[PDB]
């Protein structure tokens, strides 16, 4: 019998607390059964345990020594897997970190870890830990583990394959037989379930063919214990094709026979094809889709008839129920104008059910891009026979657009130039863009503000304006004295639900003074009739321009910031009005499309192009700023600002209101003084730019996210020129009147959009010979 | 999370005292309506103590040994 | 003035049989199944109920089949009427 | 990338002492073309007439004479599903004289009797032709690692004795060869499942098992094993899946008792004189003694090929790299002097007609003699 | 993240907590807790670390730690303290922002956080009208009540603005039997009447004009 039961070193449990938590206590005879009872109670703890019980005489020294807590938190050596998944493979396997960690368990668990690596299908040469017992009771293992992967060393086999060659099939597959890296589109790496898929892949295949009598196939997956004998083998048992003739109906529903029998319109004598009935079945499902019946059920059952090779059909269409929608609850609108989120809802909550419409809701939502989660999940009232509510979880993404620049110039004050365009602004559904260049000689303005919504009819409205003191002056004059006071405002109404034809209004003034030595100015002037001087820059002009703006647009953008398989339009045109100060006409087209070569769409290709054309109404023409520029942009890359186009000429101008000596060279009083071919891009009244890309998230980048990075390579073709052009004066100088001046660049474009930080790296090689190419091979956008 | 601000006031307005207490509907004879059907039920026996964001919001500490 | 107008409609789909089916006294669950567990009700006040049917195409015409319904506390079909198409 | 592994590879060819320096090399090749396609096929010294082939639907009866190409035939069909219908070849090699009964890993089997001419009735069975074909008492023997074990007739075939043993999900590479005796044959297995058919209905007088295989306790990838046991005197000695010495001795029927020792690659016996290589690629000797051993070895671990041969009282072993490692009057000396190919070698070596036989990982034959 | 004895590291964590170095306070608090999941210093570490999460604005960390703790010991003298902190964490989950700071045009976002805070605080203050935070959570409650009233109002409003009338009538009835306290209600009531005019819902509209005259202040 015991008289003393002593404990020491528990730190959380008392001597009496331990003595009573164990059902053995003092004053009772401790036999071997009581010893084993103390031990099984130590086992019955569940997070900590130590088997030390001694009895010599009348004393129980139960040495409950706390070698825990070991928080083996250190995962060192990860190369393809996630340390969390390792903790999980421990915890679920029964190695959770509330742990005793017997010295034996060290190697045991290392080896179990490695075994799991292999269960993935792989290898791991080592799992080593550095034991870190910290000097109260706590330990951790600096788990250092090295990997041994072997991924795709395929050999492929199927037998029974006797209506089509193995490889013809093999094509379609997630799992393929060792084809060159340049052949990769999507994903191919093994796993047991990749197999399962492939299996289905072909199962489905057969069933679509219309050969009913296959199912049978075994599980022969050749394995050599050299990590490379990774080899396939399968059997099959094919079926029987028939011809489509014969059906029977059981419409278990409110009654819509006519619509369906006309839907289910198959001619007797057709050939049997499981796809055609896949069609008809879904046809009916959605022919009800408006009718609300939330949960029908069907089994179109075929009756294969031999001695005539016929298939009868047999369907059974029990319906759902009529009117459900109760509440329209969404989830994710942290600081969102969910009000707008409901503005998307043209729907009527509190009514019957139309599937098409709930689709429309969710999908046109995600049309608004900008947010990444599909959701049309419909759970009905717990406690009422009908009456669903569809929830909507999207994962949003933010908007922010803020240009930055300090300085930088020596002869210039610290410039304060910013392009600030915050759209559908966080507090509104409504968008704004403002741009101003304040750099030591320019007060350049721009206003762009919109409301997409004055009506439920959806009308978009926006004012567009500027007041430009872009002087470009040396000090004050003979130096492009210009004041451009220009405006416009926007309205919006598409009715094809996807097609808009536009019409908008605006105004511009421009003040002109202090001409520059470029003849084309004079050309516009004289074509207008005004005859200015030519050795002198003496002339000054104004305009007041009452602008109408009609256009067209179509849109199908299948994601947001990284939209997919897009088909988008923006057409525009201009004609002059009664009572303004300028006359001309223009027409232009634009076209860019996505094409995803991947169907996981981890790889998408693009086709992009644009257009441009300017011409004058009677006797008059298209002013200059209206002409097309290009270079170093998301129209052309590899160059400097507005580089693509013709170039300009100076006429002998040695007194241009002090034609500045040592300045404004090439027919300046100091330098050249006669006719001058001058070097400066000018652009033309006609343009078009076409390119191609390929969305390409490389394996080398940690492809943990598909949202901040889209990676592609560009091709380009470039030439900008004037139409109403002659050589009669462009004889002694280069001539620009037809598309012949081809340009090209090639280069990589990197994109990783951090919420607040862009690092737009894109090196490009302009590779197409044309004169005056003033190149720039480092372009950082924002 | 602060710019020399935000110690004994919430981020933005507080309508705690501004919260409309029961401006009861006093129904005409037989013109009554179910007066409550949700959890929105407070013991009017409360306080008056730490009212509004001006209170001992710091975690009550607990004795040492 | 838009040359065309879309169409908007609300629940309670009804037909001539949907209405000719039910009859006086016919209880809550009876007419419920017969027509649907409706939504056009009285929360406070008598046991009176309604069926209306509204459908509006392209600036033209109107559907309003406003069926009034009345039960008692226990619930008995009584004192019912519709004005189809207003 | 995936070739960044620092496992311990072939330990090098040792000192090259050979008073017997490889004294012939009669070379000859189909030039094909074996490649990394894994199997064990082999030229067959049929009356010193070696009927040889390669993995393209090739065959030509050379002669173990310096090998003169006779009976040269191509092996494919050109109608139907494809032109030449690409034949890939991993069905074992055997004859009965001219009766070269051969299968293809295309589950397609050819009892070509190059004795009655081009009589090779094709054969499309459950499971593919994977093992080397045997004949028991005038009946073709069948081990497809199919789980199902068919049987057929010579020169006509008819499905029979079609036994269905155990397959695992993993579907490892294992197959097995039947060792005929006592009105039955002795084939190996892959899950330790050792239930050996007395071909009576195809009747296993058997259900005992080697408790050892992979599939649940997957362990190291170096226990590659010859799954084929061998009759002696009524005793059969076996090579269980993972490292297992054993004698579950058939005693007119089966009397089982495991004399364990790990590290299995492949073996040979001479009465008591048991010889073998360990699964780490090291070579011991032994006697039928419960697992009492001989011949310590440490230096040729992880060599490419470890498939041995002896004739004229001098053992021989080779890896790939065309290196040849010679053995002997056995120890004190085991040393290695040759590197005879670059294609290298990975199959069974054979020593027939007082000669020696082996295929090069590509290109047919370079007949080295001591 | 040092390895000091529990007293010294805990005291440094406490003084940097009060300091406002709740970032580094959290660093050393998580240090201590990951060191030892036992001992009352670990439990007070759990309390101070949930406070420091909610202070340094680690609300996900806060909620994780605190639900972990309520799973640890769901009964304690601090249960009121716990439910308090949790309702508040839901609160700052609901409306902490830059416009959540400016305070113009708010109280109409995801009330899931608000549902959580309401349930937490209401069921707490009924389970515990007995605390020095009792009336505080009470103000939080009537506050957030009228707050969600604004939410649902702006909702219902917008809805009928769509010309959407009947579902709104229903929503009204919903909040009505739900909670007849806020002014938003009486605001909504005219709108109801107007809807009744839309479909020409006569008798009920008359009824409701009377009963608002009955309630309308």
Swiss-Prot record, chain A:
Changing residue 641 to C: No effect. Lethal. Changing residue 342 to E: Severely impairs cell growth, wild-type protein levels. Changing residue 157 to A: Lethal, protein does not accumulate. GO terms for cellular component: Bam protein complex; cell outer membrane; membrane. Its main location: membrane. Keywords: Cell adhesion, Cell outer membrane, Membrane, Repeat, Signal, Transmembrane, Transmembrane beta strand. The keyword Transferase does not apply. It is found in: Cell outer membrane. Changing residue 406 to C: Reduced folding of OmpT. Residues 410-411, 439-441, 472-480, 512-539, 577-584, 616-684, 722-743, 766-779 are extracellular. Disruption phenotype: Deletion is lethal. Depletion results in the accumulation of incorrectly assembled outer membrane proteins, including TolC, OmpF, OmpC and OmpA. Decreased expression leads to decreased susceptibility to contact-dependent growth inhibition (CDI), and decreased expression of outer membrane proteins (including in this study LamB) as well as up-regulation of periplasmic protease DegP. Changing residue 634 to C: No effect. Lethal. Residues 1-400, 423-430, 452-459, 483-498, 554-566, 596-604, 695-708, 754 are periplasmic. Changing residue 440 to L: Very minor growth defect. The chain crosses the membrane at residues 401-409, 412-422, 431-438, 442-451, 460-471, 481-482, 499-511, 540-553, 567-576, 585-595, 605-615, 685-694, 709-721, 744-753, 755-765, 780-782. PROSITE patterns: POTRA. It holds the Pfam family Omp85. Changing residue 235 to A: Lethal, protein does not accumulate. The keyword Cell membrane does not apply. Contains 5 N-terminal periplasmic polypeptide transport-associated (POTRA) domains which interact with other subunits of the complex, may recruit substrates from the periplasm into the outer membrane and also act as a chaperone. The C-terminal region forms a discontinuous 16-stranded beta-barrel transmembrane region. The central pore is ellipsoid, and probably closed by extracellular loop 6, perhaps with the aid of other loops. Belongs to the BamA family. Part of the Bam complex, which is composed of the outer membrane protein BamA, and four lipoproteins BamB, BamC, BamD and BamE. BamA interacts directly with BamB and the BamCDE subcomplex. The Bam complex has the shape of a hat, with the BamA beta-barrel crown in the outer membrane and the periplasmic brim formed by the BamA POTRA domains and the 4 lipoproteins. Part of the outer membrane protein assembly complex (Bam), which is involved in assembly and insertion of beta-barrel proteins into the outer membrane. Constitutes, with BamD, the core component of the assembly machinery. Efficient substrate folding and insertion into the outer membrane requires all 5 subunits. A lateral gate may open between the first and last strands of the BamA beta-barrel that allows substrate to insert into the outer membrane; comparison of the structures of complete and nearly complete Bam complexes show there is considerable movement of all 5 proteins. (Microbial infection) Acts as a receptor for CdiA-EC93, the contact-dependent growth inhibition (CDI) effector of E.coli strain EC93; antibodies against extracellular epitopes decrease CDI. Its role in CDI is independent of the other Bam complex components. Is not the receptor for CdiA from E.coli strain 536 / UPEC, which does not have the same mode of toxicity as CdiA from strain EC93; the decreased expression of bamA101 in some experiments decreases the level of outer membrane proteins in general. This is Outer membrane protein assembly factor BamA. It comes from Escherichia coli (strain K12). The gene is bamA.
């Amino acid at each position: 019998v015991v008289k003393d039961i002593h404990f020491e070193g528990l730190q959380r449990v008392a001597v009496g607390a331990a003595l009573l938590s164990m059902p053995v206590r003092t004053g009772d005879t401790v036999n071997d059964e009581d010893i084993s009872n103390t031990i099984r109670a130590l086992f019955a703890t569940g997070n900590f345990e130590d088997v030390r019980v001694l009895r010599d005489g009348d004393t129980l020294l139960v040495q409950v020594k706390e070698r825990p807590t070991i928080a083996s938190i250190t995962f060192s050596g990860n190369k393809s897997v996630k340390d969390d998944m390792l903790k999980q493979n421990l915890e679920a396997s029964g190695v959770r970190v509330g742990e005793s960690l017997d010295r034996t368990t060290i190697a045991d668990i290392e080896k179990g870890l490695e075994d799991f690596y292999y269960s993935v299908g792989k290898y791991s040469a080592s799992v080593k830990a550095v034991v870190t017992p910290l000097p109260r009771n706590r330990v951790d293992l600096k788990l250092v583990f090295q990997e041994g992967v072997s991924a795709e060393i395929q050999q492929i086999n199927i037998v029974g394959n006797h209506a089509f060659t193995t490889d013809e099939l093999i094509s379609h597959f997630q799992l393929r037989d060792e084809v060159p890296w340049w052949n990769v589109v999507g994903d191919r790496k093994y796993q047991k379930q990749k197999l399962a898929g492939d299996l289905e892949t072909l199962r489905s295949y057969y069933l679509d063919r219309g050969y009913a009598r296959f199912n049978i196939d075994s599980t022969q997956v050749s394995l050599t214990p050299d990590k490379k004998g990774i080899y396939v083998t399968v059997n099959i048992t094919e079926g029987d094709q028939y011809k489509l003739s014969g059906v029977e109906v059981s419409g278990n529903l409110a009654g819509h026979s006519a619509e369906i029998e006309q839907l289910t319109k198959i001619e007797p004598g057709e050939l049997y094809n499981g796809t055609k009935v896949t069609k008809m079945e879904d046809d009916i499902k959605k022919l009800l889709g408006r009718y609300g019946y939330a949960y029908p059920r069907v089994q179109s059952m075929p009756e294969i008839n031999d001695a005539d090779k016929t298939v009868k059909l047999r369907v059974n269409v029990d319906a759902g129920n009529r009117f459900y929608v109760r509440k329209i609850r969404f989830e994710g609108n942290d600081t969102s104008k969910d009000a707008v989120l409901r503005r998307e809802m043209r729907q009527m909550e509190g009514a019957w059910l139309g599937s098409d419409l709930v689709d429309q809701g969710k999908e046109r939502l995600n049309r608004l891009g900008f947010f990444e989660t599909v959701d049309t999940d419909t759970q009905r009232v717990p406690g009422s026979p009908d009456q669903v509510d569809v929830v909507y979880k999207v994962k949003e993404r933010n908007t922010g657009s803020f240009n930055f620049g300090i300085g930088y110039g020596t002869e210039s004050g610290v410039s304060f130039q910013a392009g600030v365009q915050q759209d559908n602004w966080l507090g509104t559904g409504y968008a704004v863009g403002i741009n101003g260049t304040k750099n030591d000689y320019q007060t350049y303005a721009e206003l762009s503000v919109t409301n997409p919504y004055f009506t439920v009819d959806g009308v978009s409205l926006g004012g567009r304006l500027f007041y430009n003191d872009f002087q470009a002056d040396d000090a004050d004059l003979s130096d492009y004295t210009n004041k451009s006071y220009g405006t416009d405002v926007t309205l919006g109404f598409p009715i094809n639900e996807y097609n808009s034809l536009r019409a908008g209004l605006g105004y511009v003034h421009n003040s002109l003074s202090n001409m520059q030595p470029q003849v084309a100015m004079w050309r516009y002037l004289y074509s207008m009739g005004e005859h200015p001087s030519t050795s002198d820059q003496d002339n000054s002009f104004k305009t007041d321009d009452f602008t109408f703006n009609y256009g067209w647009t179509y849109n199908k953008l299948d994601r947001g910031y990284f939209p997919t398989d897009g088909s988008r339009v923006n057409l525009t045109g201009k004609v002059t009005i009664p009572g303004s100060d300028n006359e001309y006409y223009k027409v232009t087209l634009d076209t860019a499309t996505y094409v995803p070569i991947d169907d996981d769409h981890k790889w998408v290709v693009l086709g992009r192009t644009r257009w441009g054309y300017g011409d004058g109404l009677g006797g008059k023409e298209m002013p200059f700023y209206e002409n097309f520029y290009a270079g170093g942009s998301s129209t052309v890359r590899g160059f400097q600002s507005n580089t693509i186009g013709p170039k300009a000429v100076y006429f002998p101008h040695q007194a241009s209101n002090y034609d500045p000596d040592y300045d404004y060279e090439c027919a300046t009083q100091d330098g050249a003084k006669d006719l001058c071919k001058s070097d400066d891009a000018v652009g033309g009244n006609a343009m078009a730019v076409a390119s191609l890309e390929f969305i390409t998230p490389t394996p080398f980048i940690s492809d943990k996210y598909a949202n901040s990075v889209r990676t592609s390579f560009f091709w380009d073709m470039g030439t900008v020129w004037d139409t109403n052009w002659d050589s009669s004066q462009y004889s002694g100088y280069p001539d620009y009147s037809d598309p012949s001046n081809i340009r090209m660049s090639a280069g990589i474009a990197l994109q990783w959009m951090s919420p607040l930080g862009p690092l737009v790296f894109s090196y490009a090689q302009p590779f197409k010979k044309y004169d005056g190419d003033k190149a720039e091979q480092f372009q950082f956008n924002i | 999370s602060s710019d020399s601000r935000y110690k004994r006031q919430v981020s933005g307005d507080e309508a705690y005292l501004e919260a409309a207490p029961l401006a009861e509907l006093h129904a005409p004879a037989g013109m009554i309506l179910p007066v409550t059907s949700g959890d929105y039920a407070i013991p009017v026996t409360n306080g008056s103590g730490a009212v509004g964001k001006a209170l001992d919001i710091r975690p009550p500490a607990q004795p040492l040994a | 003035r838009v040359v065309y107008r879309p169409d908007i409609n609300q629940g309670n789909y009804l037909t001539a049989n949907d209405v000719s089916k039910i009859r006086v006294g016919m209880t809550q669950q009876q007419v419920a199944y017969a027509l649907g567990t409706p939504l056009m009700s009285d929360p406070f006040g008598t046991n009176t109920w309604f069926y209306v049917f509204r459908q509006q195409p392209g600036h033209e015409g109107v559907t309003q089949q406003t069926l009034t319904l009345t039960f008692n506390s226990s619930g008995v079909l009584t004192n019912i009427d519709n004005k189809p198409a207003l | 990338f995936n070739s960044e592994e620092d496992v311990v590879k072939m330990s090098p060819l040792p000192t090259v002492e050979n008073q017997f320096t490889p004294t012939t090399a009669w070379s000859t090749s189909v030039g094909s073309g074996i490649g990394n396609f894994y199997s064990n096929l082999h030229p067959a010294l049929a009356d010193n007439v070696v009927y040889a082939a390669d993995r393209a639907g090739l065959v030509k009866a050379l002669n173990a004479d310096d090998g003169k190409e006779i009976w040269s035939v191509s092996l494919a069909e050109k109608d139907g599903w494809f032109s030449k219908e690409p034949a890939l070849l991993s069905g074992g090699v055997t004859v009965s004289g001219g009766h070269v009964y051969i299968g293809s890993e295309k589950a397609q089997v050819y009892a070509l009797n190059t004795s009655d001419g081009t009589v090779a009735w094709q054969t499309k069975v459950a499971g593919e032709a994977l093992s080397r074909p045997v004949v028991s008492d005038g009946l073709v023997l069948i081990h497809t690692s199919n789980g199902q074990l068919q049987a057929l007739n010579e020169a006509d075939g008819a499905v029979k004795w079609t036994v269905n043993l155990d397959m695992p999900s993993l579907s490892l590479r294992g197959e097995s060869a039947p060792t005929t005796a006592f009105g039955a044959a002795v084939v190996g297995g892959d899950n330790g499942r050792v239930s050996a058919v007395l071909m009576e209905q195809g009747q296993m007088i058997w259900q005992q098992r080697i408790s050892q295989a992979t599939g649940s306790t997957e362990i190291d990838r170096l226990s590659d094993v010859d799954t084929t046991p061998v009759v002696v005197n009524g005793v059969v000695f076996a090579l269980a899946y993972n490292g297992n010495l054993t004698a579950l001795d058939l005693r007119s029927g089966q009397i089982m008792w495991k004399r364990e020792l790990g590290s299995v690659n492949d073996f040979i016996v001479d009465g008591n004189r048991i010889y073998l290589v360990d699964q780490n690629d090291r070579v011991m000797a032994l006697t039928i003694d419960g697992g009492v051993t001989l011949w310590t070895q440490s230096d040729l671990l992880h060599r490419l090929l470890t498939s041995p041969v002896l004739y004229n009282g001098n053992l021989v072993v080779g890896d790939s790299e065309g290196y040849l490692h010679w053995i002997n009057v056995e120890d004190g000396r085991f040393v290695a002097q040759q590197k005879v190919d670059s294609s290298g070698f990975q199959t069974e070596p054979v020593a027939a007609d007082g000669k020696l036989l082996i295929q090069a990982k590509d290109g047919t034959v370079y007949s080295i003699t001591r | 993240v040092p390895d000091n004895p529990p007293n010294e590291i805990y005291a440094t964590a406490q003084q940097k907590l009060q300091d406002g170095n709740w970032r580094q306070a959290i660093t050393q608090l998580e240090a201590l807790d990951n060191r030892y999941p036992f001992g009352p210093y670990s439990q007070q570490v759990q309390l101070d670390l949930i406070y420091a999460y909610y202070k340094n604005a680690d609300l996900p960390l806060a909620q994780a730690a605190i639900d972990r703790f309520i799973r640890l010991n769901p009964t304690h003298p601090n249960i009121d303290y716990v439910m308090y902190m949790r309702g508040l964490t839901n609160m700052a989950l609901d409306d902490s922002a830059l416009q959540g700071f400016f305070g113009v045009d708010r109280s109409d976002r995801d009330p899931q956080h608000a549902r959580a805070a309401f349930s937490d605080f209401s069921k707490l203050v009924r389970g515990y009208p007995n605390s020095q935070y009792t009336t505080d959570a009470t103000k939080r409650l009537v506050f957030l009540k009228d707050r969600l009233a604004k939410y649902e109002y702006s909702v219902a409003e917008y809805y009928t603005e769509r010309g959407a009338w009947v579902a709104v009538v229903n929503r009204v009835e919903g909040m009505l039997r739900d909670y007849p306290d806020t002014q938003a209600t009486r605001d909504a009531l005219p709108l109801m009447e107007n809807a009744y005019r839309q479909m020409q819902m006569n008798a009920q509209a008359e009824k409701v004009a009377k009963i608002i005259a009955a309630n309308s202040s």
